[PDB]
């Protein structure tokens, strides 16, 4: 959000550390990506 920073993740969401890099995954939207999700 280069406009507006103003945003987090939603109730869910987890971030792991892994050798490989840092990823972003969602218990209930199930959706795993590589960088921060929205709402």
């Given at each position: 959000?280069?406009s507006?920073?103003?945003?987090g993740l939603?109730?869910?969401?987890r971030?792991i ?8 995954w ?7 990506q590589?960088q921060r999700?929205?709402?």
């Amino acid at each position: 959000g280069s406009s507006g920073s103003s945003g987090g993740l939603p109730p869910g969401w987890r971030k792991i550390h892994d050798a490989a890099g840092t990823y972003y995954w969602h218990v209930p939207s199930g959706s795993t990506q590589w960088q921060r999700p929205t709402w």
